[PDB]
Design an enzyme around this catalytic site. Sequence first.
Site, short mmCIF file in Angstrom:
data_model
loop_
_atom_site.label_atom_id
_atom_site.label_comp_id
_atom_site.label_asym_id
_atom_site.label_seq_id
_atom_site.Cartn_x
_atom_site.Cartn_y
_atom_site.Cartn_z
N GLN A 182 0.84 -1.23 0.00
CA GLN A 182 0.00 0.00 0.00
C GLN A 182 0.87 1.26 0.00
OE1 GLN A 182 -2.14 -2.40 0.22
NE2 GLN A 182 -0.59 -3.63 1.28
N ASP A 217 -5.28 -0.17 13.73
CA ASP A 217 -6.09 -0.80 12.67
C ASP A 217 -5.93 -2.30 12.47
OD1 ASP A 217 -7.58 -1.46 10.43
OD2 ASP A 217 -7.45 0.60 9.67
#
Lengths: 287, 117, 69, 299, 48
Positions: free
Chosen positions: D10, D125
């Site tokens: 990412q 997260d």
Amino acid sequence: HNSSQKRHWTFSSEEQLARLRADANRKFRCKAVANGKVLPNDPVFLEPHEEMTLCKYYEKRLLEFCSVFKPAMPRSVVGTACMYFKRFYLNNSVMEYHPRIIMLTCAFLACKVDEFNVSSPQFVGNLRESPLGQEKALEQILEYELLLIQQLNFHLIVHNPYRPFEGFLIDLKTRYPILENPEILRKTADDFLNRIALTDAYLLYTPSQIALTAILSSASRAGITMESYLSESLMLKENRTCLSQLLDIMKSMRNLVKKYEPPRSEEVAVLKQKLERCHSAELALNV
Amino acid sequence: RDNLLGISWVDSSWIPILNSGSVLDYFSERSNPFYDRTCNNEVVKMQRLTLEHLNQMVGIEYILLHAQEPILFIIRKQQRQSPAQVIPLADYYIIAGVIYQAPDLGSVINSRVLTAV
Amino acid sequence: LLPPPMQYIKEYTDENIQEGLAPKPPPPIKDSYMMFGNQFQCDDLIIRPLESQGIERLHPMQFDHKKEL
Amino acid sequence: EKLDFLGEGQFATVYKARDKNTNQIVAIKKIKLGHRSEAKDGINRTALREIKLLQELSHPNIIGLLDAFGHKSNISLVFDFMETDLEVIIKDNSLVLTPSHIKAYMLMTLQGLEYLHQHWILHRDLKPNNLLLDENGVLKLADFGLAKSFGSPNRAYTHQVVTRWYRAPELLFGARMYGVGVDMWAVGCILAELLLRVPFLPGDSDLDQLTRIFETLGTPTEEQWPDMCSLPDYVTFKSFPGIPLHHIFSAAGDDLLDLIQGLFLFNPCARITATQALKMKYFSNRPGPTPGCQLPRPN
Amino acid sequence: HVPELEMLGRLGYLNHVRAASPQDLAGGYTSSLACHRALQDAFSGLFW
């Protein structure tokens, strides 16, 4: 820091620091001489104590720059930045990286780690520099940011002496009623803390003990002593032994604070001219 | 839960829709005293797909033993230590959509002698 | 959980035997909603409910059953 | 010595290999960023957080930044190579439906969560993935990009953070402050998935995900933690009659039934704590957690 | 060392720089979390 990490980066006693700074000065001197740009021991090479004095005056200027930041700044972020700066010159020399670039960079990296989420216009607005010159500095800032972490051994967390202070005062509001409304104690303690921060205290002493000593100095200055609080901590392991260590650390802290003084600007400008000439000297790296 | 041998459980809707394929489902209707959530068929339903998974994950696997198409459908409770290793625990037989537990050759005789004497 | 085939009323019954005297009277003709079995089976209704309730009507009110069939 | 090219990431790229030094297998990270601006922000916040937090958090159920260098513009982070990930494992068509193995995975994840909560640093997260399984199978947590410290001083607490499928109910409202609640509700959704085999609540975008969470647990009661609508952004959701946990995942052993009911409890205050959950009697029961020697492995 | 639940003078005082606040309390983060972090961190160390 029972969280380890800084357990490795807690240098234990005054001499080791002195030695390390001295050795990096020697290291730069030698690399340069070997490269052979110059004959050994020319006038340009600096001296470690002079380098340290220049660093401290410029760092007080950097603290003023942190204070005048247009967005409000948490005391944690300022502290993180100073610590990062001291620890950086324990590995390298003032000449290899000009102090101005290092100060600005420590500040931006610090803001990024501490989640202040700084706005880009706010940072540029604070600097009193021409946009083009600020952008030239920003280009260097990028490369020197990666360089900082490389020589910081990637150890980024810094313990900030604040959190402990709030905590000890809550213990104050609860365990001991002998002292009362300790807020005069609060401001004086802050005054002692800035003076403590300018010293190598961050590197040597434990930060919680640093906060406790600031509280004790404030109390002695105003009329209260915490033998009883020290006595509740004696309600603990080591039986009698804990107190002697606490007293010795407190005395050494008081001695450094009384001895530490801001470097005179007249001396500092002489030093500045010399260093400026020094970086204006031919380094040049590699092809 | 007092005596599993002395309990019978049924349900009319599932009765007309009953076939060799659905016998395990009828035992599985839940809220049935004989069967339990702990059984792995239930775990298989909670997950996905029912194939040779009873031979892979080995444990409590209710399996049909003998079947007569109209009514008779016998189910057996096995505890597997490993593939190709089966240990029979009990047998529950379904007659006319009515589930009973197969009485032991000896518990039945003990109760029987007691009542007569 | 595990309910049985339904039991006899236990709520009443004890009162109906009584001492053979002072018994509960027949309950009154509840001319409204009841719950036999599971359906409500409320009173006051017709025999053939109009097809207008639940579906379209393709036949006019003349409805000469023999011709329309 | 780069020996493999697992692929891009990412905000990073990964290569698997042995370093300039020992022959041991390790995964090597290369820094990824948009550097086009002549006024780049240097390194990204996610990177900065991840590197120091992983370095500090050292636990048998936490991965750690081991070696780290950066001579070129490149910044290299060294993390141990792992076998795969629970998410794809349970995502695949049932290769091995394994009951007590799910309980062992839950135990490793909970021990990692307890260590992170003790160290005083929230894992912002956890997502279904971002959890990695090694060859032994000890599962240690991994993605640490979005994490932050949680403390007494008031500061701009970041908002709207966890992946929509797994979102804490207080965060879904629009709450300015938070606590271990986010991580707990999320482990809760990952357990949900292991038992149900497919994701529990599906949200295409914020509002739909909040509606689906409410449908799954019913409308929160007024007694629950009134102010649930008094937090900054609330919309009365549908007045669902409500469904018992028995309804959504039809069944399993009731001890599991209880852990679930507990992680779910709505008042952020009551969301069960890490120590509290380990202390749950479900872990100390007749079903034994797998040692990991027999832990299921696919291809 | 320091205990997780306070139920002591510190909880009774319930006072921080801004004490506690109601609307955000939905946010959770009851000052409790607050003093715990504060004290634990301060006590961390004290003896190298």
